Each structure stands twice: as structure tokens, then as C-alpha cells.
Amino acid sequence: HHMVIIPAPLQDINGKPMIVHVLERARESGADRIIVATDHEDVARAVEAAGGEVCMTGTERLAEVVEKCAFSDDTIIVNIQGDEPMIPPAIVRQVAENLAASSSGMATLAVPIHDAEEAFNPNAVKVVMDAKGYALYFSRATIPWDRDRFAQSRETIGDSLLRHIGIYGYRAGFIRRYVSWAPSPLEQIEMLEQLRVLWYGEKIHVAVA
Amino acid sequence: HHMVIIPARFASTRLPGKPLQDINGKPMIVHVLERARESGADRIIVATDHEDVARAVEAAGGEVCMTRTERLAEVVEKCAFSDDTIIVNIQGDEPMIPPAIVRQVAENLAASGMATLAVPIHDAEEAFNPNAVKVVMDAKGYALYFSRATIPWDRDRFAQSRETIGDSLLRHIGIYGYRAGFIRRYVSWAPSPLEQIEMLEQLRVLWYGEKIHVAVAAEVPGTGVDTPEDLERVRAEL
């Protein structure tokens, strides 16, 4: 009972593009509507010929889709990146269900980290959550910091490290509020736009994959 | 319109018996009591399990509570307050704590339920020192997170070098504000795996969903006296 939007993308994996792969996974998730948001004709000519719906509209594209297709501000929206074609549809359904069952707002996904290099890789985003699973913070720094383990060791990690995956959930009308809100300074230092949501007081629920 | 409790930290390996040591004709805890007086508090209670500290504070006129946020709990039990009284935690080894920031934590608590202070970090070594605790907060000053990692992470600057620092790093300073029912709630909560990982007990409050307000200190306070060098320094400065 949700809609999935893919902001895209061109690669050959067994005679099929990559965006159509993402489209098939979104189909298998069981979404009522699937829309591919793009401003390029290359993505269109592929998805349209693949039977996928396209909307012609920097993550604000989905916001336009909320009003280009005139979606109710209670509908559940799932943003899958166009460059994750091997994503299982089970976690795509998860993100929607976790948003619907939480206090609503915005939702995202995390996986456990088990490689120390990953834990100390700034390109790998870590997230810390409260007891209810709501995101306390996103960061490129190694959080939560393990004082005893990391006191002098950069090769041993515990079980408290989570990597944030760029699949998101929304309640439609709040995507308009994302674009409406001014760019925070925190999202510019960390280069993580989702921190804006935490800057402005709204909370994010996190699903463990 | 607030009350101040001073944990007189007798226990210390480098200066055993900290609150009793003479600073220019007055013991340290008496000086901390005078700072609390300059803050503008309606009641000042020194919490201590030592009789010499009690007889030193009582000879100066401060209220004394015998105990044993563990210790502080018994104070809010022994003088059981209303859960509206703003409460300021001042360390007993800080005889030069600016009373302005002591008033400030209560003022910023007045507008939540738990409040604390931070000071800007200006040197790279402190920003990457896990012993220095960094705090990141939201639009209205409420702490998003406390950590021993360098947060917020400055991706573009730190990608080149960890040698220079921007303007976004704040060190949390262990002066806390409470609404006096907040403490009764805290003392009941079980330890939270997050504070065990980070060795940061304030992460209990954020783990159980309750908020913390953080204020940039109007004046940067002085480190609490823990060694004879700081004793002589405060003697020369007071």
C-alpha cells in the first residue's frame, strides 16, 4: 500500500539496463504506483519502453511528483536510488511498513557494520539511534565512538556500528516541507542532506535491514 | 529562582581531600559556595559523605547534605524538592566557576528539562581528542548527539588534513541543569548500551528519548582543581 519513486543509470547487465533492474525490484516490492523521475531522455526511452511510468520534473524531484501526480499527503512514498539495482524488494516493503507503524514522518534503512575499514571510512555514513529506533544522528565520523576498543585500535570493532543506506520513506506532504526548509549549515559540514531533517526538529525512524 | 547542589569531590588520587585545602584563608568548597552565592541561587547544598567538609561548609554558612547522578539523587531525596525547581550541578573542585554561566544554564533551562553547556573548539588537537566530548545540536539548541568522535565531521576539510579546524566544533562541559523531576526519572532508568559504548552517561537521556538543551557558554570556565599546580594557580588568581 505505497508508491515508489526512482530518481535516476545506463549499464548492460545481461542485455538489460540498470534502471530497468531497479524498476523490476520496485515492481516486486508490491507498490501501487511506480514512477521514475528524470530530466534526461536516455532514462525515459528505456523506462517507457520497459513498461515503467515516467514523470518529467537536488533530491527535490520527488517533491514535484507529489504534486505533478497530485498525491495525497497521507500516501506512503519510497525513494530508491536509481543506482541500487540489486536491492531486495523485502527491505523496500520494510521501509514503508516501518514508517507506517512508527510515529510517521521520514524513514530510512541501516545495516550492521562488520568491517573496521568500513567503520573508519568517511564515505560510509554511520547512524546512531535511540531506544525507539529514531535516528539520533547521521555522521561520516565513526559513531558511536567505542572508547575502550578505539582507545588504541583501528582494526577491531564491536557490534554498535550501523551503515545508512540511501533508501528513504516519506508521507508525501512532508517532501514539500523538505524543499521548503532552508539549507542547514550542518548538512554542509557533514555533506549529509538528511541532517537537515534533524536540524529542523523533525525525527527520522531507522530500519535495521 | 534556582537551587545549586555542589558535589564536594573529596575522592581524588592527585589531590585527596580537595574541598578542604586552603585557598587564601578559605577552603576550596567555601569558594565554590561563594560562587554559587554570586550565581543568585535560593539554596546551596554541598553534598558530601565527609564530616570535615560538612563542618567546613557549615562554618561558612552553606547548607550541607550527607550522602554516602548517583549522589545527587539522595539530595533531591533528602530535601525532596518540587519537580519545577531549576537545579544546577556545580563541581566542588571549581572555585572559579563563572557565576554568569551558572545563571545561564538555569535561564536556558527555563525555556525540555535537562540543560548543559558547551564552548567552541579552536585547536585541531582538541577536536580529534576522544577525551574532549563534542556535541551537535538542532536549530533550537537541543543536542542531537554527544560523542568522543570528531562531530560534526567536516568532510571536505578533513579529507585534506586533520590539521586545521572550521567553526562548527563544540566541547561539552560537565555542568548540568535539571528540572528536579528529570532526576527522579533518570535514577530509575536502566543503563543504555549507547552510553556503555561511548562512555558518555548523558547519552542515557538521548537514548530514552528525552531532550537536552545545550548553551554556548558566555564565558569559558576554568578546569576544576585536581592537582597542586592548579591549587597554587587558583591561590595566585583568587
From TrEMBL, chain A:
Its main location: cytoplasm. Its EC number is 2.7.7.38. CDD domains: CMP-KDO-Synthetase. It is an enzyme of class 2 (transferase). Pathway: Nucleotide-sugar biosynthesis; CMP-3-deoxy-D-manno-octulosonate biosynthesis; CMP-3-deoxy-D-manno-octulosonate from 3-deoxy-D-manno-octulosonate and CTP: step 1/1; Bacterial outer membrane biogenesis; lipopolysaccharide biosynthesis. GO terms for molecular function: 3-deoxy-manno-octulosonate cytidylyltransferase activity. SUPFAM superfamilies: Nucleotide-diphospho-sugar transferases (SSF53448). It is found in: Cytoplasm; Membrane. This is 3-deoxy-manno-octulosonate cytidylyltransferase. It comes from Klebsiella pneumoniae subsp. pneumoniae (strain HS11286).
